Design a protein around this ligand. Structure first.
Ligand code: 1MM
Ligand code: 1MM
Ligand code: 1MM
Lengths: 349, 349
């Protein structure tokens, strides 16, 4: 199970832009402490890793981590089992894993001065946000409250420290620039499949509307819904009568219709409630967010699309968290992804 | 040259601690926007990647990136040629690559509030520092001034953007906590060899004094010298008669002596002046820094050690930058590393 044979592997940077400080750089002056004077800074670039099997079959897969994560989540599970990178190289796909701008080996744009500030220009905000262990516990549906596990959980229990250590903050890089970096990657690699997760769900949908090389999307637990501009359906508030899900992203209809041209599958784990759950904010949030996604997929299908929602429990898999690709049954989750790729010929040359 | 057969690969997090916000966490209350209330945050953990060959020989190698870098520099060169990770898995060594705390997939400790601040506790500074392209150009001795190459350069010209894109800031995590994470990794791995670079040179020396499992060190272009406490020799200022090199790190003699028990090699590239060069601050800085390191190695040898300085031009390799392991002749640089490992019995089981 662990052996893997690579025809080649590597990593590279792509995308981003440059910003400049004032003045001129004098090489005879002390270079350290570092100065903005005469400075050119590369910002908002993305890190990309690839592993290619011998004699690949079908399209390369681009695995895109969720919010506050990195490509680590596709490399290994918290308890050290093979991640989807290894499983799909073994399945004879070339596999790209990214650290998007602002995360991991992607660029964090900061300079000499308060965080994110280049002289008088605010590239990203100095004030950050970041989930706690407790927030992530309920966000990812390990259980209804920190320390608790749902019955039949597939979380790798005992490896909580490993799991939460993989998570961190994201600077306020614009989503436009994150999407731009991945569009450039898709141009670089050719026809490919995007496999997204939570926060990258809506970003991957956006990439597909700008990049015809995206030939399919599988989105694990996408966090933000997407609709044609002015056609967002009625979406109820949460059971606490006061909160709402994330404002759906709206794109022009001519771009939205590009989503009807490729196979798209949204995948959800277990323990999303059917009924309002006022006592558990993030469980109720997932209920209404999944509902909004069902309407988004229906809108894609009314325009001639091939969009579907897979609830893992209906496929016979019980207990998955919001990271099904690192849960204890991730091999079975991978099998369902192989099934999708095979159904649409994305595993053939 | 590109193929690699892995018995296993993966990644994991190790080291770090936790800090806590005030108050308690209520799962019924809105979890987003994220709050410090009731929060546990994992901070200062390190990312570790490993690739293991079939039938490994000798000790595992731990590759430790320089300042503002990540394990990318061991994966691939800026122009896409195999890095030392691939070369030494092919040489039948298990290879670990790290993103140290505060870099890449390592943790950047920030919360909900101004960067690095947890309520009124400053975990890392809000004001950052970061090299420009211009500062890094002369730091790494691509040439004497930005945009200019030494005639003999081994840099992969044309891939400047790719190269500079791999560099970024480091938050003010204490060096103690960075050393702590790698000591914990070395305890987990068992006997190994540290391969360090620039800023991680002094940190690897410190790790060796705390971890008998470190059985050898090869340091490329180390940036800070180390001496026994109270025994720093006379080191001249730079040619501008105002600047100094980095204040040498001082450790108790009992720990310093541990450096005499293992083979240690410092490796320097080309274009470091023999004579004072006041027009080019970083060239002169490298002259005096290399001199300080020569005295450091001499001090280890006077304690019965086996500490050597390898200037790559004396081995027939001309024009290397301060990243010899990603230069155009990196295969030849690797050969010299294999020779060190072999001579010292580190390539046998
Ligand atoms: C892995 O888990 C998630 O990925 C994840 C999963 C579920 C919800 C949220 C996230 S997230 O933390 O990244 N945030 C996100 O998708 N975007 C977003 N949108 C708005 C409008 N506000 C905020 O506030 C943070 N975030
Ligand atoms: C994921 O499920 C829970 O999280 C969960 C849910 C409810 C209770 C307990 C757990 S548990 O997992 O902590 N522990 C558990 O189940 N213990 C247990 N021990 C014995 C000795 N026998 C039996 O059952 C016969 N159960
Ligand atoms: C890849 O290049 C290097 O590794 C590298 C190479 C040569 C010099 C500097 C660096 S560095 O930028 O990271 N900084 C470093 O080693 N430590 C350090 N120590 C002091 C006392 N001040 C500062 O200020 C920056 N830094």
């Amino acid at each position: 199970k662990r052996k893997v044979v690579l025809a080649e592997q590597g990593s590279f940077y792509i995308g981003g832009r440059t910003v400049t400080g004032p003045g001129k750089f004098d090489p005879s002056k002390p270079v350290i402490p570092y100065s903005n004077e005469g400075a050119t800074f590369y910002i908002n670039q993305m890190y990309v890793n690839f592993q290619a099997p011998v004699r690949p079959r079908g399209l390369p897969l681009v695995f895109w981590h969720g919010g506050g994560l990195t490509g680590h989540i596709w490399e290994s599970t918290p308890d050290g089992r093979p991640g989807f990178q290894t499983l799909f190289v073994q399945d004879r796909h070339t596999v790209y894993t990214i650290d998007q701008p602002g995360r991991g080996r992607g660029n964090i744009p900061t300079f000499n001065g308060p965080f994110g500030q280049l002289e008088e220009e605010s590239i990203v905000n100095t004030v950050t946000g970041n989930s706690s262990k407790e927030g992530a516990w309920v966000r990812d549906r390990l259980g209804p409250a920190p320390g608790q596990f749902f019955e039949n959980s597939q979380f790798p229990r005992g490896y909580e420290d490993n799991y939460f250590k993989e998570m961190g903050f994201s600077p306020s890089i614009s989503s436009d620039e994150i999407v731009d970096a991945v569009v450039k990657l898709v141009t670089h690699i050719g026809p490919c499949v995007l496999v997204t997760h939570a926060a990258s769900g809506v970003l991957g949908m956006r990439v597909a509307t700008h990049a015809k090389n995206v030939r399919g999307i599988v989105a694990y637990e996408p966090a933000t819904s997407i609709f044609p501009k002015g056609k967002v359906p009625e979406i109820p508030p949460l059971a606490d009568k006061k909160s709402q899900i994330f404002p759906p992203f709206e794109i022009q209809e001519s771009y939205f219709k590009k989503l009807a041209k490729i196979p798209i599958q949204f995948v959800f784990g277990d323990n999303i409630p059917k009924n309002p759950k006022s006592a558990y904010w993030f469980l109720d949030w997932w209920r209404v967010t999944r509902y909004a996604h069902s309407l988004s997929l229906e809108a894609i299908n009314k325009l001639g699309g091939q969009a579907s929602l897979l609830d893992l429990p209906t496929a016979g898999l019980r207990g998955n968290t919001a990271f099904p690709f690192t849960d204890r049954n991730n091999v079975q989750v991978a099998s369902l992804l192989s099934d999708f790729l095979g159904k649409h010929g994305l595993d053939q040359n």
